[PDB]
Amino acid sequence: GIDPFTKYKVERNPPAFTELQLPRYIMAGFPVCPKLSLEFGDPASSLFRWYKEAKPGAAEPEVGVPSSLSPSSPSSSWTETDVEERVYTPSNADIGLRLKLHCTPGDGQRFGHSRELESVCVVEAGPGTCTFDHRHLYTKKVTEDALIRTVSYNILADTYAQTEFSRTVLYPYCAPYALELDYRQNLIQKELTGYNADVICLQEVDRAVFSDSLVPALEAFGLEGVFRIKQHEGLATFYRKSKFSLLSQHDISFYEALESDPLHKELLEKLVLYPSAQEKVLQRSSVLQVSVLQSTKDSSKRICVANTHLYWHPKGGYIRLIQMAVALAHIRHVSCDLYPGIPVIFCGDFNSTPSTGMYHFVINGSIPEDHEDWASNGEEERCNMSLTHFFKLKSACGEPAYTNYVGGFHGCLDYIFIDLNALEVEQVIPLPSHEEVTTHQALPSVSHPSDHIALVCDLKWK
Ligand SMILES: [Mg+2]
Ligand SMILES: [Mg+2]
């Protein structure tokens, strides 16, 4: 009815849902993570109730009649479930059924008007096994305050997969349905949420994947994220709110920093002696995400979390060297100048195996001017120089046989680098066995949602 006090009153914007979406793909044993954009409220104080179709086909959609959210069907075609949580995980018994979510926005003090929506898909059977199933045995609980469970994962961008070409030439061994973004995202949501991690650094994140898949899944499990585009896709970093808050951000673009920031003046002076190499470096659009996190448990503890995806080309060794030199100089500035020497975690797809110049530089703190990678793409783009950096770094998950495994290539390209003076490794969550990885020849597969393998480790302060 009419509120008779509105003439006397300036009144609140009530809690209200401003996006409500269900996944377009749903599978038994995989969490259904609704997208909720909640204004003037929070999901934690909101109400959720899940319904399932009474039996397959029972809920016939109203023809031509509009809803702004979903199809609409008779209320009597639906059965109320047990589940009053934001996330619903279907069972085998749900196979063949559509789902319906009824939710009421709240802010802890009051509720706003409820909305409801139905899935357009039915629950499907899930894969028999996934490579992360055994790994999840190690990550059943959120870690204690003394630990930082850290993930690094290149999740394979739809913008590079989705293709018929990618399907027929790069990934011909993979079931086409398992290459589909919606299938891979459902696996990725289960994978990442099951790691129960504190810091998650991702690469090859499509913008829409960030907004529609990762944020809804990970925020349901207590993590918040930030995104930085490269060109067609980019980087994401998530952190567990119960253990960290985001204190500051210091993202850079390597070409932009190298040419315009006096921090890198000495490196730039070395490179201008090599016009052709310099041109190739400054044409690259790789970026570096840097997030300084404040511990919610200990006011004295802050950590510098960096994330990157370096230049991809096999002959791009000298470019990756220069990109990492810029990254580490920038990270030194943030972690040692803007903050007085805080620990560094540096995740990424570095597109560099352990035998490369870039890797040598990282773990030794220097590289000589005569290293062969200074002519990785031939004489004209040669750029011999000696570099040094400040850090004592080690790879927390070591040097696996590979972290990227496709039909035509495999190698260790991904690392979680840590400041070994400040952090140590409590445990490494084992990568899938070679026999697991090759069950469907290579990756991705019906059982594994990327062509890379997630690195997961538990770190501790020294
Ligand atoms: Mg890739
Ligand atoms: Mg790569």
From Swiss-Prot:
GO terms for molecular function: 3'-5'-RNA exonuclease activity; exonuclease activity; metal ion binding; oligoribonucleotidase activity; poly(A)-specific ribonuclease activity. Its EC number is 3.1.4.-, 3.1.13.4. It catalyses: Exonucleolytic cleavage of poly(A) to 5'-AMP. Its cofactor is Mg(2+). One of its GO terms (biological process) is regulation of mitochondrial mRNA stability. Mg(2+) 1 binds at residue 204. The modification Phosphoserine is found at residue 70. Ubiquitous. Mg(2+) 2 binds at residues 349, 351. Residues 59-83 are annotated as: Disordered. One of its GO terms (cellular component) is mitochondrial matrix. It is an enzyme of class 3 (hydrolase). Belongs to the CCR4/nocturin family. Enzyme that cleaves 2',5'-phosphodiester bond linking adenosines of the 5'-triphosphorylated oligoadenylates, triphosphorylated oligoadenylates referred as 2-5A modulates the 2-5A system. Degrades triphosphorylated 2-5A to produce AMP and ATP. Also cleaves 3',5'-phosphodiester bond of oligoadenylates. Plays a role as a negative regulator of the 2-5A system that is one of the major pathways for antiviral and antitumor functions induced by interferons (IFNs). This is 2',5'-phosphodiesterase 12. It comes from Homo sapiens (Human). The chain holds residues 154 to 609 of 609 of the full protein.
